[PDB]
């Protein structure tokens, strides 16, 4: 890719790969494109930085349906580190990527027998369970794993997503509360919890959804989803025929402020880039949904 | 000044002390890293530690969730749950000090540039046998100890973090302590008046539509 539609040094490629590693991006094609070149034409330049790149490129190639590079990287990693446990996990993932689940299960059982306090093998077994569509067994195994190993946020988020996919929202809301308690400075969790509470039930659930949408918008002022949700929840609560006058007028005031902010934001957006297609349209949405 | 010194002593006694102490400190750091420790923990220990951390985090940050969930978790944790190596670090310093005193002591090394009192003299002139010499002039061992003591900041700078220098108990007890600490905590919601705080001013839509939308990688 160097001198090929781009002009970057090997340091720039390494930094881009590291940044793609920090945030869990899953653009397999670009990762493979950069990684194969980095492995081939700059192997000696990287003193000790090639093993994590090997792992990342192998995973991306497995995701990209290109197994020759995966096998090459796996062979290199196995040759460098004999008897390691991460390499066994990679081998199991390669096995299960070809719809060979019994071998992966026996490999993970062997890993757990060698070391009983290992975490990745249990997660891979749960992934194997999920790959076959067996949702209830996966949920049960994930619940057992969380019972054994609490404080793992990835498992909590995965369980919340699985519960969302099954149209069971109370337990998903509980899991999102558990996630939000550890990370009170993250607006995305508040936004998702507000969405779940909006989708769950009726009046008090809508009140909590509005509260957490407001909290998410307070944490970050660039969150347009939070603003839209706040406006929609305020409008929904205002028109409910089982609310007192005080709550009705408070929600009307909230909706008016939200609509004004939305209109100002869309005017700001239209000022820079000239399209003028939604500023003429969002106003109609605001007008037709008034009161 | 008062004394006339041979340049050869400056060339061959001063620098080697500094080089030796510097590289000895570096070797000590690397060796300490090499055999620092090897610890293993059973599953119950880590599980209980994670449970304790979760309980502490609940106690600290229960003010960001609805009160009903906080008290639901507080009904839990109360009924069902809570109630159901150096020898090389220090000895080489003394050994090297003794070896240096053996193979280097016997001549004036250098002089500090500030006046001192007679109290300083017994410390800085271990090797010499004079009587009326001033306390500013130092011996070799005192110079070695001064060089050893004056390198902590240099080691912290040129080397990662700080090294190369000298300076639960019972699960049931911890469970009882956390049970007693958690019992006196009460919910105080932090979202009671968030709307009024939001309504005070317009949103900060400044400095958000600069630059340009990204097209591809790099």
């Amino acid at each position: 890719k160097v001198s090929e539609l781009y002009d970057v040094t090997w340091e720039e490629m390494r930094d881009k790969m590291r940044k793609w590693r920090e945030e869990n991006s899953r653009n397999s094609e670009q990762i493979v494109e950069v990684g194969e070149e980095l492995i081939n034409e700059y192997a000696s330049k990287l003193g000790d930085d090639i093993w994590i790149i090997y792992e990342q490129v192998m995973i991306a190639a497995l995701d990209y349906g290109r197994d020759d590079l995966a096998l090459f990287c796996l062979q290199e990693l196995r040759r460098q580190f004999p008897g390691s446990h991460r390499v066994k996990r990679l081998t199991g993932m390669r096995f299960e990527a070809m719809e060979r689940y019994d071998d992966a299960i026996q490999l993970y059982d062997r890993i757990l027998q060698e070391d009983p306090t290992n975490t990745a093998a249990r997660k891979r077994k749960i992934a194997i369970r999920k790959a076959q569509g067996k949702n209830v067994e996966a949920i049960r195994e994930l619940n057992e794993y969380l019972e054994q190993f609490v404080g793992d946020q990835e498992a909590w988020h995965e369980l919340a997503e699985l519960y969302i996919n099954e149209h069971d929202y109370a337990k998903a809301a509980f899991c999102l509360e558990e996630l939000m308690m550890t990370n009170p400075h993250n607006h995305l969790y508040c936004q998702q919890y507000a969405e779940v509470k909006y989708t769950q039930g009726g009046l008090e659930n809508l009140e909590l959804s509005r509260k957490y949408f407001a909290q998410a918008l307070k944490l970050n002022n660039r969150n347009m989803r939070a603003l839209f949700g706040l406006y929609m929840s305020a409008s929904h609560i205002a028109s409910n025929p089982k609310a007192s006058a005080k709550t009705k007028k408070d929600n009307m005031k909230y909706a008016s402020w939200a609509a004004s902010q939305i209109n100002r934001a869309y005017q700001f957006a239209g000022r820079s880039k000239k399209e003028t297609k939604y500023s003429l349209k969002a106003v109609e949405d605001m007008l037709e949904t008034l009161q | 000044p008062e004394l006339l010194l041979d340049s050869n002593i400056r060339l061959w006694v001063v620098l080697p002390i500094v080089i030796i102490t510097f590289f000895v400190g570096m070797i000590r750091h690397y060796v300490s890293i090499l055999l620092q420790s090897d610890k293993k923990l059973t599953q119950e220990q880590v599980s209980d530690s994670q449970v304790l951390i979760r309980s502490r985090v609940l106690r600290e940050n229960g003010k960001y969730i609805p009160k009903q969930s906080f008290l639901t978790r507080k009904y839990y944790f109360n009924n069902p749950e809570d109630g159901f190596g150096n020898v090389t670090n220090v000895l080489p310093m003394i050994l090297i000090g003794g070896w240096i005193n053996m193979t280097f002591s016997g001549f004036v090394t250098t002089k500090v540039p500030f006046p001192l009192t007679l109290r300083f003299k017994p410390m800085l002139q271990q090797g010499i046998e004079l009587l009326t010499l001033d306390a500013s002039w130092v011996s070799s061992a005192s110079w070695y100890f001064l060089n050893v003591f004056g390198l902590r900041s240099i080691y912290s700078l040129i080397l990662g973090q700080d090294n190369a220098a000298d300076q639960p108990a019972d699960t049931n007890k911890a469970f009882k302590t956390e049970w007693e600490a958690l019992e006196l905590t009460d919910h105080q919601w932090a979202l009671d008046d968030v709307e009024e705080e939001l309504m005070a001013k317009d949103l900060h839509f400044e400095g958000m539509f600069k630059k340009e939308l990204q097209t591809s990688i790099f």
């Binding site: 619940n143 969380l146 019972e147 609490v150 369980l159 099954e166 149209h167 069971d168 337990k171 509980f174 899991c175 989708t199 929609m232 409008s235 929904h236 028109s239 949904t289 | 009903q68 008290l71 639901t72 978790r73 507080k74 009904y75 839990y76 944790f77």
Partner: peptide, 21 residues
């Protein structure tokens, strides 16, 4: 609010339901 509106309807450690004022 009107027209387009969709209603989707259908034991992780601690889970309680009632009272505790």
């Amino acid at each position: 609010r009107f027209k387009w509106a969709i209603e989707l309807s259908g034991y992780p450690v601690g889970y309680l339901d009632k009272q505790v004022p």
